[PDB]
Amino acid sequence: VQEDHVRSSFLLDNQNSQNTVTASAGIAFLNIVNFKVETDYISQTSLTKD
């Protein structure tokens, strides 16, 4: 009388988020013929769990 059990379990996760923020300027004809401002911002987050 022989027997056996197998019980595999496989649970995987992922949370791959992102951001991208940009600003701008460019007030330039009068009292200052030119000055320009722009910022950039990018953020990532990738978290896997198995």
Next chain:
Amino acid sequence: PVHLLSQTHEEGYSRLECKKKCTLKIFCKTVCEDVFRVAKAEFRAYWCVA
């Protein structure tokens, strides 16, 4: 419960850290970053005698 012996140890474990952080209350990122930490415990043995 008369005090057998007091003693201290200093070990470090890189703990668990899965925390979410908001950028400007609009979006949030989860910055998982496990941090070092020297924990310490003072082992106080108390020999039990009748």
